[PDB]
Amino acid sequence: ECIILGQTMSIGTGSFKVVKGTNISEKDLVPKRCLFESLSNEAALKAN
Amino acid sequence: AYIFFGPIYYQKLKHMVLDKMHARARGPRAVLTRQPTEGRSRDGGLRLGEMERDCVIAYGASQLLLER
């Protein structure tokens, strides 16, 4: 019933999957940030 | 070796190759059409039966199934 619907069978060649590695490091996947939430953090909990 | 030589009454039949070369690329009304004299001789044709679907399962090819 995979040849009727046109699906790939799960035996033989389609018994696995191949995927491609991105080969990227965590040095490029950083949450880059320089003086964004510093203005709103100090003047929100002072004396209140 | 001494080779057996002599005349034999041969005879030429029907069923030449010129009217059996049948091919098809894409779409109906195939481009290489044989002569329309079959006469209770439909031997499958340009098809892919259930016996031939079971052969490529035994090889384990999954994308040739989707291609054919």
UniProtKB/Swiss-Prot annotation, chain A:
Location of this chain's protein in the cell: Nucleus
Transmembrane stretches, start-end: none
Note: Present with 6020 molecules/cell in log phase SD medium.
Family: Belongs to the RNA polymerase beta' chain family.
Assembly description: Component of the RNA polymerase III (Pol III) complex consisting of 17 subunits.
Function (record text): DNA-dependent RNA polymerase catalyzes the transcription of DNA into RNA using the four ribonucleoside triphosphates as substrates. Largest and catalytic core component of RNA polymerase III which synthesizes small RNAs, such as 5S rRNA and tRNAs. Forms the polymerase active center together with the second largest subunit. A single-stranded DNA template strand of the promoter is positioned within the central active site cleft of Pol III.
Protein name, per record: DNA-directed RNA polymerase III subunit RPC1
Gene this protein is translated from: RPO31
Swiss-Prot record, chain B:
Location within or outside the cell: Nucleus
Domain of life: Eukaryota
TM spans (from-to): none
Family: Belongs to the RNA polymerase beta chain family.
Additional free-text comment from the UniProt record: Present with 1950 molecules/cell in log phase SD medium.
Annotated function: DNA-dependent RNA polymerase catalyzes the transcription of DNA into RNA using the four ribonucleoside triphosphates as substrates. Second largest core component of RNA polymerase III which synthesizes small RNAs, such as 5S rRNA and tRNAs. Proposed to contribute to the polymerase catalytic activity and forms the polymerase active center together with the largest subunit. Pol III is composed of mobile elements and RPC2 is part of the core element with the central large cleft and probably a clamp element that moves to open and close the cleft.
Quaternary assembly: Component of the RNA polymerase III (Pol III) complex consisting of 17 subunits.
Protein name: DNA-directed RNA polymerase III subunit RPC2
Organism: Saccharomyces cerevisiae (strain ATCC 204508 / S288c)
Gene, per the UniProt record: RET1
Entire-sequence positions represented here: 1015 to 1082 of 1149
